[PDB]
Amino acid sequence: AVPPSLRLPVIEAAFPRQLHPYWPKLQETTRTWLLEKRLMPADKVEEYADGLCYTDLMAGYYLGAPDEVLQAIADYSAWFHVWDDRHDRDIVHGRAGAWRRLRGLLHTALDSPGDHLHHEDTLVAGFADSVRRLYAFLPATWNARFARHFHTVIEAYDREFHNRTRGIVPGVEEYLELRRLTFAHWIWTDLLEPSSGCELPDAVRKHPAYRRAALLSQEFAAWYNDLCSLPKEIAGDEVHNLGISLITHHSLTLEEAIGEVRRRVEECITEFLAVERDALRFADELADGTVRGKELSGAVRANVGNMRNWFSSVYWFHHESGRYMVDSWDDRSTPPYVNN
């Protein structure tokens, strides 16, 4: 059961949880990858990795993915959380040069991941390994789109670095725009496509019903993370959180801000329910009697189904993962799974 302040009865009643059959092997294989790529200290991997639930988060989302696609996605997701931790620690310790150099290497590795598979920075080498595998599933046009999206994500992380080093809390609207980039909304959306085995043409994925369903799934995930990660973020001097923007710029108390974030999250669900109908009608229209139409219809339907699964996977992840359990830590500002 979930605490009342975080509970979403519509998720519990109407978004039943799903789990990909590869999850048990996924859990161990990603743990071993974190150890072998030296992305976290060995003792922290053994003590904390399974409890962080990163593989569970992906296995509740990309249902139907081939096992090797899911493995690359899960390794990438675990990497992404470690990168968020590295960025945080570079900020806390004032390592502006180390951050700048990492940022530059990630831009280069994103365009040429094979060149960086054995880089001396293990964080760069692990990024490159996951991305090179992601680049092997679909035509290079998809790879180029993933790269365009992730270049933007890296720069949003750089903006967060600047904000936190200057002590700036973004305004609410500025924050909502930035959050689509720091949460990597378009990366998770891109990854729907190798999971269903089809690169969608621009005309299909830019259809208004597809686009809006994709957006709402990610807005829910990011803002629900803001709701659940607010305690650890306040304790860690993080400034990027819708609740923090509301407290800072709209003069809300903590209780009022929690209520407002909750209401915005709830609205994503019922807006998604409306647009999902339109997205599934579009999927039906794509089934025009042709083979290609059947393929595109099935891919769109699978992708919209996984946009729905993201809601339940993110919901339960936030109650299971050790990442957010700040009340258990000796130092609330320093999670035990980060290298400090």
- Known binding residues: 84, 88, 225, 229, 233
Query: Of 81, 71, 192, whose CA–CA distance to 133 is shortest?
Result: 71
Q: Which is nearer to ligand RIS, 226 or 276 (CB)?
A: 226
Please state the closest distance from residue 179 (CB atom) to ligand RIS, in A: 8
Contact 224, 265 (CB under 8 A): yes
Contact 106, 124 (CB under 8 A): yes
* Contact status: 321 vs Mg ion (CB under 5 A): no
Give the distance, in angstroms, between the CA of residue 4 and the centroid of all CA atoms in the same chain.
25
* Contact status: 182 vs ligand RIS (CB under 6 A): yes
Burial of 277 (0-12, 13-18, 19+ CB in 10 A): exposed
Please state the closest distance from residue 244 (CB atom) to ligand RIS, in A: 11
* Contact status: 79 vs ligand RIS (CB under 6 A): no
Which does residue 11 bind out of Mg ion, ligand RIS, none, counting CB within 5 to 8 angstroms by kind?
none
* Contact status: 313 vs ligand RIS (CB under 6 A): no
* Contact status: 80 vs ligand RIS (CB under 6 A): yes
Instruction: Measure the CA–CA gap between 287 and 281, rounded to whole angstroms.
Output: 10
Query: Of 331, 321, 337, whose CA–CA distance to 43 is shortest?
Result: 337
Q: Using CB under 6 A, which of 128, 184, 215, 261 touches ligand RIS? A: 184
Give the distance, in angstroms, between the CA of residue 182 and the centroid of all CA atoms in the same chain.
9
139's CB contacts (< 8 A; 6+ apart) are 199
Please state the closest distance from residue 134 (CB atom) to Mg ion, in A: 21
Which does residue 184 bind out of ligand RIS, Mg ion, none, counting CB within 5 to 8 angstroms by kind?
ligand RIS
Please state the closest distance from residue 318 (CB atom) to ligand RIS, in A: 9
Residue 287 CB-half CA count within 13 A: 11
Q: Using CB under 5 A, which of 229, 297, 309, 312 touches Mg ion? A: 229
Please state the closest distance from residue 24 (CB atom) to Mg ion, in A: 28
| Interface pattern 81-110 for ligand RIS (x via CB under 6 A) | x--x--------------------------
* Contact status: 84 vs Mg ion (CB under 5 A): yes
Long-range contacts: 98-107, Cβ < 8 Å, 24+? 99/158, 99/161, 103/154, 103/157, 103/158, 106/154, 107/151, 107/154
Instruction: Measure the CA–CA gap between 53 and 182, rounded to whole angstroms.
Output: 20
Query: Footprint of ligand RIS on this chain (CB under 6 A)?
Result: 80-81, 84, 182-184, 225, 229, 323
Per CB under 5 A, residues contacting Mg ion are 84, 225, 229
